[PDB]
Design a protein around this ligand. Sequence first.
Ligand SMILES: [Ca+2]
Ligand SMILES: [Ca+2]
Lengths: 279, 4
Amino acid sequence: AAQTNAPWGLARISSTSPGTSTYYYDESAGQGSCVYVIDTGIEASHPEFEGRAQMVKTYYYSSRDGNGHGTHCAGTVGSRTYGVAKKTQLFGVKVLDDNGSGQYSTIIAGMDFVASDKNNRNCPKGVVASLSLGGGYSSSVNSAAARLQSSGVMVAVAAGNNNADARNYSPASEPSVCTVGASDRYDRRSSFSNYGSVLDIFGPGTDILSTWIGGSTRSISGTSMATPHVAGLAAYLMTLGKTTAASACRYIADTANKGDLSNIPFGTVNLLAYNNYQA
Amino acid sequence: AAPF
Ligand SMILES: [Ca+2]
Ligand SMILES: [Ca+2]
């Protein structure tokens, strides 16, 4: 399949080169997979989700996304126009309040929730979790992320936006998950992107168009935007049978575009997520 | 935490 005039990040993840505008992907499109978006919620009523999104948990007075961040991330995973995996099932877990804040005990509860809740869902092709959030290092947050991964979920986490070593942030610093840095449309490391040995992969993260609350769209930037490209890519590859939740981060790194990015500090991987789709 |  070919989507013309796609957002640049979608075009990038199906290309060996920067500077193109068509997203190429197998029509299976993540059908039969599931992605949990652990964030501020998802506006499931957005036409872009086509009935494939739903809220499954909140820790606040409402499950509504009053912020937008979670809706945007979900759109990059799986919206019809803006998403990588256009037929995946999207499940929202609101661990962050409408101000974007979440206590670590709530984030941990939400990760343990997903590890259990997947057993209540139909995801024959596999399960992914996208965590575009974090804070300072916490062993308990990292352990929660490690348990979620161990339970059979492909966990993708944002590296953070401090232009610093991700080793000092959580869940970014948990080794066993897939820690995602951000790039821009000219194949530069995004200026804000964290880096370091704990990064597994980069994805598009600067000036990413996606869904927003109120049935709208907008372009924003962050490692938060890179993470759902990788989460969506994992769901897509799982549907194709190319990998599994335990192996997807390795598979994505194995099959990535190598050496394309600039301003990658010495000791950080130079790997950009790539679907290797050949019509 | 905060959103990224
Ligand atoms: Ca290249
Ligand atoms: Ca890792």
